[PDB]
Amino acid sequence: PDRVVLIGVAGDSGCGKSTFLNRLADLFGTELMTVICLDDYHSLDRKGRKEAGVTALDPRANNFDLMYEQVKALKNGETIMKPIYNHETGLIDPPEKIEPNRIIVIEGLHPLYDERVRELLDFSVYLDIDDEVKIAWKIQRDMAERGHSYEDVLASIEARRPDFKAYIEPQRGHADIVIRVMPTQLIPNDTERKVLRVQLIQREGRDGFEPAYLFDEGSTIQWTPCGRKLTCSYPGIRLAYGPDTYYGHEVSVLEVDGQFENLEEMIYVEGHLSKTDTQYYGELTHLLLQHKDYPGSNNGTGLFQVLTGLKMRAAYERLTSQAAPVAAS
Amino acid sequence: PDRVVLIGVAGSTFLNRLADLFGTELMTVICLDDYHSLDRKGRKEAGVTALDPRANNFDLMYEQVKALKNGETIMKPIYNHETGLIDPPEKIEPNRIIVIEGLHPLYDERVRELLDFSVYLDIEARRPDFKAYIEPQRGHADIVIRVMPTQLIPNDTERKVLRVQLIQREGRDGFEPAYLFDEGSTIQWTPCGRKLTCSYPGIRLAYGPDTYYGHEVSVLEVDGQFENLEEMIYVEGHLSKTDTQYYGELTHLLLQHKDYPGSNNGTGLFQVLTGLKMRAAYERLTSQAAPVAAS
Ligand SMILES: [Os+3]
Numbered sequence: 203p204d205r206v207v208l209i210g211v212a213g214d215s216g217c218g219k220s221t222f223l224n225r226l227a228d229l230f231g232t233e234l235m236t237v238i239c240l241d242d243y244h245s246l247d248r249k250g251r252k253e254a255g256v257t258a259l260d261p262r263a264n265n266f267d268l269m270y271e272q273v274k275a276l277k278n279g280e281t282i283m284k285p286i287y288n289h290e291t292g293l294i295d296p297p298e299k300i301e302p303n304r305i306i307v308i309e310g311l312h313p314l315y316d317e318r319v320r321e322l323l324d325f326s327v328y329l330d331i332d333d334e335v336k337i338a339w340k341i342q343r344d345m346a347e348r349g350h351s352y353e354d355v356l357a358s359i360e361a362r363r364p365d366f367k368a369y370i371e372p373q374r375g376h377a378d379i380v381i382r383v384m385p386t387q388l389i390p391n392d393t394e395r396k397v398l399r400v401q402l403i404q405r406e407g408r409d410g411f412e413p414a415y416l417f418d419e420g421s422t423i424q425w426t427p428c429g430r431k432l433t434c435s436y437p438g439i440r441l442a443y444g445p446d447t448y449y450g451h452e453v454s455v456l457e458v459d460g461q462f463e464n465l466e467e468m469i470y471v472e473g474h475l476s477k478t479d480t481q482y483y484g485e486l487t488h489l490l491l492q493h494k495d496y497p498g499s500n501n502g503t504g505l506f507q508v509l510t511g512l513k514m515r516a517a518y519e520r521l522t523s524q525a526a527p528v529a530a531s
Numbered sequence: 532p533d534r535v536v537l538i539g540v541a542g543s544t545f546l547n548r549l550a551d552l553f554g555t556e557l558m559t560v561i562c563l564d565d566y567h568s569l570d571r572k573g574r575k576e577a578g579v580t581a582l583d584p585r586a587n588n589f590d591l592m593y594e595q596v597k598a599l600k601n602g603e604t605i606m607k608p609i610y611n612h613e614t615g616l617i618d619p620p621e622k623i624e625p626n627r628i629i630v631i632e633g634l635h636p637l638y639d640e641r642v643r644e645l646l647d648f649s650v651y652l653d654i655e656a657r658r659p660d661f662k663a664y665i666e667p668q669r670g671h672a673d674i675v676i677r678v679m680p681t682q683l684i685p686n687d688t689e690r691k692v693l694r695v696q697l698i699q700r701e702g703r704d705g706f707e708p709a710y711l712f713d714e715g716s717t718i719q720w721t722p723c724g725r726k727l728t729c730s731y732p733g734i735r736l737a738y739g740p741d742t743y744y745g746h747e748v749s750v751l752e753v754d755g756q757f758e759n760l761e762e763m764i765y766v767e768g769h770l771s772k773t774d775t776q777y778y779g780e781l782t783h784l785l786l787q788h789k790d791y792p793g794s795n796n797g798t799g800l801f802q803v804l805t806g807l808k809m810r811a812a813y814e815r816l817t818s819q820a821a822p823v824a825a826s
Pocket residue numbers: 343
């Protein structure tokens with residue numbers, strides 16, 4: 203059976219605008235993977251939302267019944283006629299023809315919201331970014347190309363909180379992996395807002411998914427690779443691993459704080475991680491340095507985005523007994 | 532050549548543990564109080580303590596220790612602690628291992644160079660002379676076992692739970708320090724978790740490079756108490772370059788005599804580990820198996 207694998211990606215970065223999906227495209231290519239933006243399943247257009255007094259985050263603005271049916275149909279090998287939500291006009295355009303593929307990624311705000319859709323997913327990721335980090339990034343991006351559109355991100359964050367906490371964040375409890383970004387604990391008065399502390403919160407007991415760990419599985423460790431063999435500059439790099447309870451479930455949290463200045467630092471860290479699901483030594487570093495221009499390229503953000511990708515590849519190859527798709531040259 | 536190996540021990544249950552490891556047939560222990568140049572009355576007369584270098588004959592010490600390592604029999608004096616007198620010489624023949632024990636095994640430069648391995652054990656009136664003449668020997672010891680109060684219990688009142696440090700000297704050829712996880716990097720570890728259930732406050736290890744008396748060292752550290760077997764073995768299994776000859780030898784040797792003090796904490800663990808590092812040093816120098824206790 204030509205099996206269709208389904209991947210869910212929860213996040214607030216907008217459709218086609220996250221670096222994680224670019225990294226997935228680098229890994230799996232674009233020929234045998236199709237990405238579906240879940241804003242296409244809005245039951246209410248922009249005017250309709252205003253009329254109703256609800257935001258896009260509200261479940262009532264979204265059609266989960268149609269979502270379930272068309273995603274179920276795709277996994278069952280059927281072609282679908284899915285709607286297109288135009289973000290510019292704020293209208294719902296005529297359906298698009300989407301055929302099945304080896305991998306189907308559903309991306310958006312509510313991929314893990316409905317019980318029925320959850321059960322169709324084979325792997326899932328929630329990208330949890332701290333408000334302050336999101337804001338600091340927006341200023342750095344604005345600084346580069348002279349955009350100055352960060353005051354609207356601030357407005358958006360504050361006003362979204364109620365609906366974000368109500369309907370978006372609880373999906374973290376159902377995600378296999380949660381990449382959690384937040385400010386550093388290595389620097390006392392962080393003014394630059396550059397150095398990040400990132401957590402890979404991995405769900406236990408999901409058959410066909412072995413969490414990555416450091417040193418000893420199921421025990422708690424704090425590690426600093428800087429020392430005799432590796433020279434870092436202040437504040438350096440610090441890892442942490444340990445078991446924890448997240449949304450009432452057992453998880454295994456792998457954590458990196460700091461910035462990678464160079465190759466040696468990246469490989470030294472990669473080499474000492476366990477069950478990273480790399481197919482050869484140095485694949486994370488190799489994949490991470492593929493596109494150094496991406497944000498998070500020199501810290502835990504990129505590292506864990508890539509690592510998550512490998513865990514999907516593992517899941518795919520387990521379900522199909524076949525090699526996963528790859529990007530061309 | 533029937534080579535004689537020399538071990539120095541500054542600062543005991545440690546020697547009992549060594550006797551358990553190496554036996555008493557092929558190891559002779561020499562108490563360094565036997566090389567007092569001044570008897571108890573002489574010390575009073577001079578106004579010095581036993582800790583003072585002037586109360587001790589390092590020239591005779593060097594010569595007789597040098598002679599022992601060279602395969603010669605010696606006629607060494609006996610210092611009677613009860614009467615406080617120096618009795619007639621004792622005949623001591625060479626042996627596979629010679630341990631010199633006392634306050635000043637690492638004090639003299641000439642005696643230091645004869646030693647193949649060395650240990651300092653760091654567990655009111657003595658303080659001046661202790662700080663003046665005893666403690667600086669820590670800077671020359673290959674291993675220093677350092678005991679101190681715990682950091683696991685806030686406002687510790689019992690004073691029972693201990694934090695112990697195995698400070699291992701780097702660059703001593705024929706001695707690879709034990710480490711945890713990654714050599715030359717800093718780590719803090721707690722084995723209690725999914726696989727191991729501890730009772731409060733549990734156990735916590737730490738390893739990392741440091742500078743001690745101006746030298747590079749590698750500090751392995753345990754804080755807490757071992758309630759049972761499983762805890763001891765779990766810790767042992769995750770240590771690296773412990774110089775055990777089989778899995779579970781530390782635990783086995785540590786539980787040999789549970790009645791000893793430090794039996795259920797880092798004190799005993801590191802006493803045994805230190806013993807293994809001596810065995811390693813011996814077997815490297817002789818290209819031969821070290822002595823063992825009978826059954
Ligand atoms: Os932007």
